[PDB]
């Protein structure tokens, strides 16, 4: 048995490993989104940078989960990582809609794990998610919702113009 | 009787308390405007910041009036504060039109109080309003009129595009 | 429906709007307390500053609640703000007793909302209150209790002397 | 009755006082461990420093609990402090095993108190433990487990050599 | 036998261990005094700080004794630590009277140990106490006597006023 | 057809996408290695850091390949990422042997792609690999070979001692 493990259920341990997989999948999705917007026939630098940043953030979230797994005396177990859902991501609007779908799925997984921890009377797990994940996710979903609204406002009858302007005047670029 | 009060009519004292109520009402209106533009389904940061700044300015004007009330030996009396006139504020154009209506109402209240002070031969009151309120109000109404003209110019046949551009290129944002 | 809202009950949304009203009411109460102690016939600068600071703190708490409402995809709704319970606040002891009553009422509203969030399995709400409100309130009530004890000790048979000394030697002034 | 106490059960108040006793006992245990490794016939400076640091940490945890007791309006009550379980602590391996036993006992007491607070709907207590105790304890137990593994690896057939090397190359010394 | 011990009697070794117990008891007494004055219904910050400082000083004196025990080749032996004599400490005057009683008891224990060392022709022990304990104790008792006189002068017919003033104008606070 | 693509074969484009998969697989392998050495029952910090660094390096190599794919007008295509070959990695010696196997496989894939580029008369591809991959790989394999030799020298009859010493005195740790 583990020399450090205390109040750490096998159910939580397994769910943490699954969440790691979900975060690494999300990271991979964002890597694909980023490089799609770097295509010479797409060429929206700010959009590329937005999603490349998120790929790093999701990687870092998986790493924090893995650190916590070891701090509690659980055992990291890695599974195959499925490829992203699409090879080409459409417009900035299509991409941002796919991103918010993805983030809502991660948020629900966090809420589910928090509920398991609550049920198992695992306050360290619950605190961990509250401190490092739940508000980060709320903030990000709010940002994406703000972006969706602005993108939608800019479609008008001149979609190309709007998509350029959003990239130039809202998103961060060199 | 008051140990300091001199040349300070009961009519002015009452009118100052009413003006405090008007300024705090205005502050509350601007708080509502600000948070409406922060909604994820509205998402115009520069517009939000514009009105949040005005909520602070109107609060500060009420505080200056209350300080003056005490300096003259009058007695602050607070009344209930009515909620703003709307729960949702429409477009940036609708909001800026509502703001200029509100500011003209505050301006007329200032002019009325100045007239009362003149009639009562209360030069300290008249000076106070001239020094800290009348030109501030003229300047703000001119700014709002400038904004209205630019907003109106941008409606064209592409309202969403215009409303984005005004927020991005005229109003202050991060 | 809202594009960002997730795990955010209508009951919590409503209770957040009510709490905003309670905090803005509290802010208004403290504004009145502050200006009462600035009266030339009251003239306790440190007491004035103490309550003016609290008016700002309560305003800021309402603003944080409104920011959170929007981050979750709820809708701010403002109601009329009732005037404070008194026009004149008596002695520093009377005022500090009224303040602790007010703070206990805010604390109970926070605890009630935390309980609703717990019941609704809304950990982001619960975390939010824990992180930004509950300990701030405990700390403030402890400070007020400390002040009450010192004020009470100083009444003796020389109330005016004691009230001066407390203002001069405990409360912050210029 | 207490002027500040609110939502603070007699059960929590008592359990906090018991936990203070447990932390001060732990501090005393670590003081004994530290001075044992400073003996001229033991002479493992890094081990001495490790346990002297923990004696301070446990003292500080008791002080934080006592501060919180007063912030909530409970009453500190002190009991006799039992002497540590041993007068001589054996090898570094024996000592580190005793330390992890002790830390698991403190951790379980924290988890028990968190559970009481949950049952009593005392979110300030629960937050307090989450914010200042639970993760600190997880981190420390993980560190001790890491140390145990390294100590165990170094026993081999040359225990004295291994115990020197661990002290020199893992633990902090002058 | 000990490899370093020289001219260090078993009687001195035992008496040093007893003195450690007395100093740790004193430290614990001062911890209790400090937290009593932090109660919201007592609320004398300067008094709290005075006794919390002494709790640290007495802890440090025990640590210096334990260091010396090991430097001489004696063996630290710890005993149970009795709880302080009171749970509630009365007025600042009551507390300062209890403190000077406690310090006179520590002083007599130091003088007794110095006498034992003299009798045993143990000049290192005698020097140690002279250099690090005897004058520190004389200085502290003189300070406490000075405080008692000032506290007593301030009782008059207005005890609460006097106790506030002493805390504010003699003792160190934030 | 692509507006920028020139002298970029479909065979190279496909092989670049496969190499991206190989590098991301390698990154994932190193993530698993790193977290295995962070286990409380393994606890070799320098070994953990060594492999976590390599996980980042391999991620960065995949990113450089994807950037190049777009610069040439090829299309990134992502595939599922298989999980690492082991869940537990044995000793530092076992791990370093697995790492050099992995690196030789990456090196051969680089050499194969260089050969394809040579055959296709694609000097930009050949230069790219020479400039950013081939020498980096040679250097890393030499480092790993150096480490293997030192690890092997340290096994002796005291494997645990040797594995500690290598981690402490060759690998970088805090
Ligand atoms: Cl798939
Ligand atoms: Cl109304
Ligand atoms: Cl009312
Ligand atoms: Cl015992
Ligand atoms: Cl006793
Ligand atoms: Cl596989």
Swiss-Prot record, chains A, B, C, D, E, F:
Name this polypeptide is given:
Ferritin light chain
Q: Which family does it belong to?
A: Belongs to the ferritin family.
Locate the region Catalytic site for iron oxidation: 53-60
Positions carrying N-acetylserine: 1
Coarsely, its chief localization is: cytoplasm
Please share what else the UniProt entry notes about this protein: In horse spleen the light chain is the major chain.
Any one GO molecular-function label of the UniProt entry: iron ion binding
Keyword DNA damage included in the entry's annotation? no
The entry's Fe cation-binding residues are 53, 56-57, 60, 63
Task: Show the Pfam families listed in the entry.
Answer: Ferritin
Cellular component terms per the entry's GO annotation: autolysosome; autophagosome; cytoplasm; cytoplasmic vesicle; ferritin complex
UniProt-listed PROSITE patterns: FERRITIN_1 (PS00540), FERRITIN_2 (PS00204), FERRITIN_LIKE (PS50905)
**What keywords are annotated for this sequence in UniProt?**
Acetylation, Cytoplasm, Cytoplasmic vesicle, Iron, Iron storage, Lysosome, Metal-binding
Write out the annotated subcellular location.
Answer: Cytoplasmic vesicle, Autophagosome; Cytoplasm; Autolysosome
Q: Which organism is it from?
A: Equus caballus
Output one GO BP term.
iron ion transport
Q: How does it assemble?
A: Oligomer of 24 subunits. There are two types of subunits: L (light) chain and H (heavy) chain. The major chain can be light or heavy, depending on the species and tissue type. The functional molecule forms a roughly spherical shell with a diameter of 12 nm and contains a central cavity into which the insoluble mineral iron core is deposited. Interacts with NCOA4.
Q: Which gene is transcribed and translated to give this protein?
A: FTL
Keyword Metal-binding listed: yes
Functional description taken from the UniProt entry: Stores iron in a soluble, non-toxic, readily available form. Important for iron homeostasis. Iron is taken up in the ferrous form and deposited as ferric hydroxides after oxidation. Also plays a role in delivery of iron to cells. Mediates iron uptake in capsule cells of the developing kidney. Delivery to lysosomes by the cargo receptor NCOA4 for autophagic degradation and release or iron.
């Amino acid at each position: 048995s583990s020399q450090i493990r205390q109040n750490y259920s096998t159910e939580v341990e397994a769910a943490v490993n699954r969440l790691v997989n979900l975060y690494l999948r999300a990271s991979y999705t964002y890597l694909s989104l980023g490089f799609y917007f770097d295509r010479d026939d797409v060429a929206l630098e700010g959009v590329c940078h937005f999603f490349r940043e998120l790929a790093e953030e999701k990687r870092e979230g998986a790493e924090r989960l893995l650190k916590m797994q070891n701090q509690r005396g659980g055992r990291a177990l890695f599974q195959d990582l499925q490829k992203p859902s699409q090879d080409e991501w459409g417009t900035t609007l299509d991409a941002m809609k796919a991103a918010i779908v993805l983030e809502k799925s991660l948020n629900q997984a966090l809420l589910d794990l928090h509920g398991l921890g609550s049920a198992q009377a695992d306050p360290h797990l619950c605190d961990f998610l509250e401190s490092h994940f739940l508000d980060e996710e709320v903030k990000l979903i709010k940002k994406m919702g703000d972006h969706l609204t602005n993108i939608q406002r800019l479609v008008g009858s001149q979609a190309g113009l709007g998509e350029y302007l959003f990239e130039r005047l809202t998103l961060k670029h060199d």
